[PDB]
């Protein structure tokens, strides 16, 4: 019988501590029951849970021992709630503060953001931790687009300006195999809920406003903040379906530089805008919301660079760090001094990917003993090896989730 010691503060964790005497073969359940035991308040406790901290992971094998975990004297254990605020921000640019569990693999915690926010096919999506107000719930924000923004805060806002400026937004992908706490995610920090894989199940006009709506503004700020490209004339009737889109809003001035990206506000004026958005809203003035919102989504994913989530690696035996494209159906190379792809593996082409650890490399293997290794220089090894399982697992779908196959093909 040894005394072991659990924190027990809430503001600060390590404030308030308590002291009980364990037996090594004491069980999680019984070491819960005895910190509750010396905590003066009545509150329920079903939600508290124990942070070994020294091997990222909560104890929730209630009828494990502490020897069966390893625990001993020196253990920093850490007693609090496993469901906590996050500040969640939406494609749409608002926020909303919910409660997330901090123990559930990610891939439940946003299924559970999701089904609260009535969107469908959660594994679609997925969450980003912050780079290094806000509102309420409710169906009229969720459902409905929002005005045209600032034109002064699209030329302000920092936009990607090449296609390694491209590459930053996917080193924020948190696992979704693991846990918030084991990702460094504290209560009250921000996280993104975005379309991560662009392979859309059964998106119908009618079943999915708020899913809808929410792609349709990951599409457009995509488009208004050059995170991808599109022609002039494109363009325009981008820029007359957002139009189309708000002023059908509005009933249940135009500013031409509000639906356009920076690049077309600075070479155009208004007034020479204006026509040419409204000559173009000629053709799609007799859609109803929700048809606008498809067909501005049908155009998005007709562009050339559609669908691809762009990562720097360096290939086995490269002596120079090049782009890799993540796709729906494949992966794309591109040389960066040739400025073009150079080569494209489909993922009916695939058998095995796996991560090699002790060089942290992606290694994948092809039909005719076809191999291909990379190191990864943008985001991670586990954020490239996610994406590409993912993908394979969601082109599964047309036959409820397999969430074994899933963490299978994704290495979780």
Known sequence: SWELRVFVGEEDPEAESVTLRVTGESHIGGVLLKIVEQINRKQDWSDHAIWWEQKRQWLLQTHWTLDKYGILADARLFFGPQHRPVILRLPNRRALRLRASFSQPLFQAVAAICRLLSIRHPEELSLLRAPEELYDLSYHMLSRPQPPPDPLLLQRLPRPSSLSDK???????????????????????????????????????????????????????????????????????????????????????????????????????????????????????????????????????????????????????????????????????????????????????????????????????????????FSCVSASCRIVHEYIGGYIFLSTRERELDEDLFLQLTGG
């Open 167 to 373: 590459t930053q937004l996917h080193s924020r992908w948190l696992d979704s195999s693991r846990c918030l706490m084991q990702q460094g995610i504290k209560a009250g920090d921000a996280l993104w809920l975005r379309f991560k894989y662009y392979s859309f199940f059964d998106l119908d006009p009618k079943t999915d406003p708020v899913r809808l709506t929410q792609l349709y503004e990951q599409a457009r700020w995509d488009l208004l903040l050059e995170e991808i490209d599109c022609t002039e004339e494109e363009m325009m009737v981008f820029a007359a379906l957002q139009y189309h889109i708000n002023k059908l809003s509005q009933s249940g001035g135009l500013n031409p530089y509000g639906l356009v990206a920076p690049r077309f506000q600075r070479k155009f004026k208004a007034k020479q805008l204006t026509p040419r958005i409204l000559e173009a809203h000629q053709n799609v003035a007799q859609l109803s919301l929700a048809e606008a919102q498809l067909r501005f989504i049908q155009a998005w994913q007709s562009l050339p660079d559609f669908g691809i989530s762009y990562v720097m690696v360096r290939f086995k035996g490269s002596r120079k760090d090049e782009i890799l494209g993540i796709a729906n159906n494949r992966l794309i190379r591109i040389d960066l001094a040739v400025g073009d792809v150079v080569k494209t593996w489909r993922f009916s082409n695939m058998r095995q990917w796996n991560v090699n650890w002790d060089i942290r490399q992606v290694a994948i293997e092809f039909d005719e003993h076809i191999n291909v290794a």
